[PDB]
């Protein structure tokens, strides 16, 4: 793992010791190379997971997330070059350093064998994110957004720390290999129920749930493009990874302590997908779609069946890619008109014909167009739930309908229709942002070709 | 389309537009041309009968009774000229109506294939840059101070001046560009 982390560190001196002109090229290229190096984790020729030390490891669940996190860095760097073009060299270097630190901390979190390192880094991913949001966001709601984002997470995480320390005092170690073989039934009691709550609510607030999801749209709306990308793609997957890892020691309390959360998720899916219809802000639309999608992940993880974990992993990967893509697409038009409203620019297929194919393909991946992996996850989650209770497919299906509806609405009222002739400032598409969409899309094709990689420990 | 409707609609205009809609819906019912001619003569007779009715109280009452009768026995699927609102080819070509400023972003390579056109275009742009201030002042200096406006534009009173606000009527993309 050091062979993936130490290069990510040396990227920092490469960022600072580089000439102002060649600072972006070097870091971008070497980040691509590190994304390449991260592909050795897929060399799993057995059912024996990779343990590199007492601290670093990588299972079939953490490897996809690590590769996605190593691959998103250069895309964020690229997306973050049109803005920052008028900022000073030191500010650009500081932005790049924030992004690199995020990459490093996330790779650590996904490689961690122990839950205390996971927690420390889970929390350390707040500093660079908050800085990015509040320092390079454009409107004044930056600050309230950062506040929400900090304190939802911390108020959720503190109980998690208490519960981890309790488990330490009771068992002797917070290692994940040991806590899986040395396990005991949790006697059903209010104490252990509060332990379940403590262990879960931090992640549930980070996925997020329906009842607690207001920190996400504020951030995405008020966050620069890179922050939105990393947030949507990884900083939500963080909670699902945590739940999947920690739900082994909460058996069987998960059988009856889940109904509230399964239910909230299944219903908030509908609520959010419906919000995505009467929504003026494109970024808010993307965020509410993300919430609708993560609700399924939460429910799946709650029922903890193999099909369920598999669909959840696939949906995590695919949603990360496609949401990063949609935010890139939105910011493309934002850089022209400097407005987030989806009603102002509504004929962009008559000027950007190629960029519209990216909109089309993304909105098709947003909805479940097969054989996309955005669809296999939804399908296996639907199947797991149907097995759970045959009355879930009702809500699943109305969510499907609403999903198609608002994705089509997005692309229609944004690209199709009559062009806004007063928008003389609609410069053609930049090779850079086109490369961005291509790099977001092609990996989806490749995964759809080889889904065995993004299944997870269950398969 | 080219003209802006007035503040309110007079009575004669109301009657003429009712006449037009009635004759169109009647054409829609009376599909055959002879039938239509006959019932249109009848309709013109019905109109011309109360043509010299001077009073207004009864005029508006007749007009409203006629509007009621028209809403009744109204063809649900009336004929609608294709290129007109509600027609098959209404905005079928509004996707090829690319504005002109999309050429300011053209690449010199794309331009070298149409040199004469772009020379002419620069001529036009100079014309516009020259006429701008003059037409702006022509507008600001002849706004009725009564306080009520009319939405109609004035012509180029002075010679050598171009009519104000012409670059969007002129330069308007064609109606069937392919």
């Amino acid at each position: 793992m050091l062979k993936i982390i130490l290069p990510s560190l040396m990227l920092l001196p490469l960022t600072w010791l580089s000439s102002p002109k060649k600072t972006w090229t070097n870091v971008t290229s070497y980040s691509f190379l590190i994304s390449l190096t991260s592909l050795t984790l897929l060399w799993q020729t057995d059912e024996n997971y990779k343990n590199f030390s007492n601290m670093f490891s990588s299972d079939p669940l953490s490897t996809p997330l690590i590769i996605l996190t190593a691959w998103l860095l250069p895309l964020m760097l690229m997306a973050s070059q049109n803005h920052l073009k008028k900022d000073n060299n030191v500010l650009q270097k500081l932005y790049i350093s924030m992004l690199i630190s995020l990459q490093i901390l996330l790779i650590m979190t996904f490689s961690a064998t122990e839950l205390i390192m996971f927690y420390i880094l889970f929390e350390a991913t707040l500093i660079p994110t908050l800085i990015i949001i509040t320092r390079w966001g454009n409107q004044t709601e930056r600050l309230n957004a950062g506040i929400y984002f900090l304190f939802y997470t911390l108020i959720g995480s503190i109980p998690l720390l208490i519960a981890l320390i309790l488990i330490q005092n009771h068992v002797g170690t917070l290692n994940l290999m040991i806590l899986s073989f040395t396990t005991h039934t949790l006697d059903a009691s209010w104490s252990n129920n509060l332990l379940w709550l403590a262990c879960m609510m931090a992640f549930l607030i980070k996925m997020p749930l329906y009842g607690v999801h207001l920190w996400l749209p504020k951030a995405h709306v008020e966050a620069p493009i890179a922050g939105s990308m990393i947030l949507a793609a990884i900083l939500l997957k963080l909670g699902s990874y945590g739940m999947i890892r920690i739900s082994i020691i909460l058996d069987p309390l998960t059988k009856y302590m889940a109904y509230p959360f399964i239910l909230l998720s299944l219903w908030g899916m509908i609520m959010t997908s419906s919000i995505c219809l009467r929504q003026t802000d494109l970024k808010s639309l993307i965020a509410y779609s993300s919430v609708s999608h993560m609700a399924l992940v939460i429910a799946s993880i709650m029922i903890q069946t193999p099909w369920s974990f598999m669909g959840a992993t696939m949906l995590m990967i695919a949603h990360g890619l496609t949401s990063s893509l949609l935010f890139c697409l939105a910011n493309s038009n934002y850089e022209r008109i400097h407005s987030r409203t989806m009603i102002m620019a509504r004929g962009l297929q008559m000027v950007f014909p190629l960029m519209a194919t990216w909109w089309l393909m993304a909105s098709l991946a947003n909805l479940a167009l097969p054989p996309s992996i955005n669809l296999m996850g939804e399908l296996f989650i639907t199947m797991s739930l149907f097995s759970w209770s045959n009355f879930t497919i009702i809500l699943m299906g109305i969510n499907i309908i609403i999903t198609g509806m608002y994705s089509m609405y997005m692309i229609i009222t944004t690209q199709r229709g009559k062009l806004t002739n007063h928008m003389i400032n609609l410069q053609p598409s930049h090779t850079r942002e086109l490369t961005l969409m291509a790099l977001h899309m092609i990996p989806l094709i490749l995964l759809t070709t080889s889904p065995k990689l993004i299944t997870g420990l269950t398969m | 389309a080219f003209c802006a409707p007035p503040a309110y609609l007079t009575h004669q205009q109301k009657v003429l537009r009712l006449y037009k809609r009635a004759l169109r819906h009647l054409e829609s019912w009376c599909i055959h041309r002879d039938k239509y001619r006959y019932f249109a003569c009848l309709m013109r007779a019905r109109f011309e009968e109360h043509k010299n009715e001077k009073d207004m109280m009864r005029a508006t009452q007749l007009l409203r009774e006629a509007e009621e009768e028209f809403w009744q026995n109204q063809h649900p699927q009336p004929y609608i000229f294709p290129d007109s609102p509600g027609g098959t080819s209404f905005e079928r070509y509004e996707c090829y109506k690319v504005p002109e400023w999309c050429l300011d972003y053209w690449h010199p390579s794309e331009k070298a294939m149409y040199p004469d056109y772009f020379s002419k275009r620069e001529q036009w742009k100079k014309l516009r840059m020259e006429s701008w201030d003059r037409e702006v002042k022509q507008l600001q200096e002849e706004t009725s101070p009564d306080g009520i406006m009319t939405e109609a534009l004035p012509p180029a009173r002075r010679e050598g001046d171009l009519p104000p606000l012409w670059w969007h009527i002129v330069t308007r993309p064609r109606e069937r560009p392919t």
Binding site: - | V98, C102, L103, Y105, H107, E110, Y117, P177, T178
Partner: peptide, 12 residues
């Protein structure tokens, strides 16, 4: 007879 067809910049 032939006419210039207006189009965006498709070079990029």
């Amino acid at each position: 007879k032939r006419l210039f067809v207006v189009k965006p910049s498709l070079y990029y």
